[PDB]
């Protein structure tokens, strides 16, 4: 049973890892791509299985880190600075910050983060995925428009340099099909058909089965082009003309400025905020995560977070061996270059939209947002309807919606590096400003801990 | 009882009239509701598009003896008269697939034997009128007492499956006409139709069909949901199919440079081949003399056509007028059979096609007028079918609005129609129960009082019958499909009691 459980924890680890880094590649001009994230996830999984206190957590790239990497990439492109050396110095500031945390007693702010901030954070991260996949679809339709005629001798060796006949519609079809198949396998896992063991096994592999089906569909279409996953053959870096394997803190093409080394403290404090929040939703493990992320930043490798996983690895000392096996197999996943380069990006974007929509379903803020449109006689048995009036809970949800709108406006500004600051500013809003608007009983009934 | 044998001649017809015609003012004023307008807009497309497709196919199979215009005019006139005079006004009278097979087979016979096709059709219609008057006089329609849920559900499931299969085959044909290629010809002529492969036509057709089906199903689910005010929710859910059609038509309208196949109607109210025939067919030949023997040899094709129309039309009437669908105003079988076959025979005199009651269209029309909430009641009237027939008749003059409707949107609508027509069939429920474990079977008598492997054996015998009927539909002896269906009537009554116990037979088969 252990040999079967390590197969399951592979694919559950594989599907975001091949997705996010691909996103990261398209967000970083392949300077920071699939291979860096895969090898970083492998080495950090090995080290976390060997040295971690709690092996129930798994380490991997997540959405908030991707948003921060895009914010820093836009910051560097606007200021003309080098990106990955700034990442190196942010990492150095992370080592010094976390060793100060160890020198102090610990993180005493764990009680200040409430259900308010976690709901706002998760609803913002789920809203980012849908926006990103729809923006990618719009970009594909802008690259290859629906025209009466096309130039049928375009050159495609670096990238398609002109419009193409059926690429945009096939990308839309692949995205919709992958999302639909993932949602229906998720439905089938909770249905009443088939034997229960076989139904649960099939529904547990909902993402890999949909991925395999859509990859087969695109593979058996011969003439139409669809953009594929950019994966190098071996242990090589994604963009060799951009950076080497080891990245010196001084400079690659231009030396790093004196001012931005000491000013690297300000973005590095926000990395620690983002790692702290999503590890709390899912301090020795925080030490290992931040320290390994800062060490891996020297090699141009991504920071990871702490995420929880289902009880399949609990049924596998045994759970530490399973983590080491899945980490070394994630390392060996880069060796399967042909079957990873035959995967379209539209399949991964359908999976991306599926993960966003699935992540929306467990949030009480989303439940109240749906409760805005229902009549008051259809509101459920939950205590925040029986003990809080409909107008008061609607005002509460409207305030949270206003906060989400403020966060989305700030993320759209050029100064989008201040998103963790504005999002941690909701704790002074909850602990100070909300008791002036609401009463007490409504406040312990709405964002009640559980 | 609506299915009884009285000794007085034309007794079933006069009692059908006496039981349905007092409800005429309620049949007029029961339609004053937005759901009836939504049903009109739904059934108009659902009855116009098969008329266009079958008229084009008929004009291809013959030498334009019977084209799109004749089918549209006949459908409009027969629908108007059947709505104004019928005993079951919720039936939809239109062309069907077996009728096309008979018309091409009879055209092949008349071309081989050198006879005139339309005059032979006229004499077939005369014999049809004679046999339907004789059958209604003898009250022969009571024979449909011998059609139980076995034959009804087998026929309804077969028709729904062929509908879904035909829609998917149309989509696959659209893919085959415009394949996914590396390169295309830029100057493809478009005047009769596209003469070659085109980019973005197959995939956009698939996207339009999928989007229309998805919007129809989501707006169906919104009707039974708990969101929005209840009145607004019911109004939006009632117009779910028109809203889906409008949304995807607007999506196709805002895409400029991509070709999609649009709905096309003939121009003007004229015959398809003015040289071959006029408006009125003379029964004593048109250019040559009509032989006397074929005047008497029309009895066998008239019997075949009467058997076809009788079985589809009466099994449709038993399906729509089931007691589980909460029909209260009453139905009619003798009057409906008399009207359908008599107007078919009269329309054959003008060269117009004869028509029958179609199962999928009539079930869709009744389902679009059923008030949900478990079924409370059905909005039954004579205005929705009359307006659908009138709009089919005026659809030639509706060219600027019908030229903007792509065929893929209607293909998604047809897929939605087939999927919703599967619901309500116990054979489909047992087919679904074949895949569920016995833990999750519902609280129905045929699960509680019947062992689960016996229920599965009953379902498997029905699947064997469906497969045999599908094979008969595939082979060129497709006109024997009703007769093979007749073979399911002794199968319930003779062979099944040898292998099943009596309580299991009244539990699995009921009324
Ligand atoms: C490769 C597999 C091929 C199929 C081989 C299938 C061969 C096969 O064994 O299945 C028989 C199975 C019935 O099995 P059976 O009812 O005896 O066993 C029950 C069943 O497994 C339920 O799913 C369980 O409920 P839950 O979910 O745990 O809550 C229940 O557990 P418990 O709670 O009572 O203790 C079990 O007792 O279902 C079918 O009849 C046809 C399924 C459709 C067959 C699909 C045909 C494609
Ligand atoms: C603005 C605006 O006009 O809405 C006011 C109205 C308030 O609803 P309100 O409670 O006053 O009225 C009840 C509501 O219509 C229920 O849907 C009815 O039940 P059903 O379902 O018919 O059975 C119920 O009838 P009953 O059965 O209890 O006697 C009605 O009493 O609608 C909303 O629900 C707000 C949802 C926000 C709608 C936002 C849409 C943009
Ligand atoms: C539910 C998911 C829906 C996805 C819709 C994607 C829309 C992309 C629009 C790009 C805009 C743009 O900039 O287009 C650029 C070009 C320029 O010329 O415009 C077009 O040629 C417009 C083509 C629009 C096609 C939209 C198809 C919608 C089908 C919906 C099926 C559910
Ligand atoms: C919810 C609704 C879903 C519906 C999906 C239906 C798919 C049917 C596919 C039929 C293909 C076929 O048969 O394609 C046929 C053609 C080749 O035919 P040819 O050589 O021109 O034949 C000419 C024959 N003549 C000469 C008689 C005219 O192949 C292709 O160009 C490749 C089509 C690939 C289809 C993939 C589309 C995406 C499907 C998955 C979406 C999730
Ligand atoms: C990274 O690769 C891209 C191609 O996607 C290239 O345009 C860019 O110049 C590379 N970055 C370098 C060389 O720094
Ligand atoms: C009309 O009839 C003639 C003779 O049967 C035939 O040749 C012709 O194709 C038909 N159709 C048209 C449109 O003329
Ligand atoms: Cl049919």
Swiss-Prot record, chain A:
Tissues expressing the protein: Detected in erythrocytes (at protein level).
Record note on what altering residue 320 to Q does: In SPH4; Prague II; induces abnormal cations sodium and potassium fluxes; decreases anion chloride transport
Site label Important for anion-proton cotransport, positions: 278
Segments in the Extracellular topological domain: 25-32, 74-82, 139-167, 221-260
Result after altering residue 85 to M: In SPH4; Coimbra; also in AR-dRTA
Result of altering residue 166 to K: In BP(a) antigen
Effect of mutating residue 186 to C: In DRTA1; reduced red cell sulfate transport and altered glycosylation of the red cell band 3 N-glycan chain
Documented effect of changing residue 145 to L: In RB(A) antigen
Effect of residue 206 to R: In DRTA1; detected subapically and at the apical membrane as well as at the basolateral membrane in contrast to the normal basolateral appearance of wild-type protein
Effect noted on mutating residue 243 to W: In SW(a+) antigen
Residues in compartment: Cytoplasmic: 54-56, 104-115, 189-199, 361-398
Outcome reported for the amino acid change (mutating residue 418 to D): In DRTA1; impairs expression at the cell membrane
Effect annotated for changing residue 414 to L: In Di(a)/Memphis-II antigen
Annotated consequence of substituting residue 41 to N: In DRTA4; decreased expression; decreased stability; no effect on dimerization
Source organism superkingdom: Eukaryota
Record annotation: effect of changing residue 29 to W: In ELO antigen
Subunit record text: A dimer in solution, but in its membrane environment, it exists primarily as a mixture of dimers and tetramers and spans the membrane asymmetrically. Component of the ankyrin-1 complex in the erythrocyte, composed of ANK1, RHCE, RHAG, SLC4A1, EPB42, GYPA, GYPB and AQP1. Interacts with STOM; this interaction positively regulates SLC4A1 activity. Interacts with GYPA; a GYPA monomer is bound at each end of the SLC4A1 dimer forming a heterotetramer. Three SLC4A1 dimers (Band 3-I, Band 3-II and Band 3-III) participates in the ankyrin-1 complex.
Role description: Functions both as a transporter that mediates electroneutral anion exchange across the cell membrane and as a structural protein. Component of the ankyrin-1 complex of the erythrocyte membrane; required for normal flexibility and stability of the erythrocyte membrane and for normal erythrocyte shape via the interactions of its cytoplasmic domain with cytoskeletal proteins, glycolytic enzymes, and hemoglobin. Functions as a transporter that mediates the 1:1 exchange of inorganic anions across the erythrocyte membrane. (Microbial infection) Acts as a receptor for P.falciparum (isolate 3D7) MSP9 and thus, facilitates merozoite invasion of erythrocytes. Acts as a receptor for P.falciparum (isolate 3D7) MSP1 and thus, facilitates merozoite invasion of erythrocytes.
Family statement drawn from the similarity comment of this UniProt entry: Belongs to the anion exchanger (TC 2.A.31) family.
Protein name: Band 3 anion transport protein
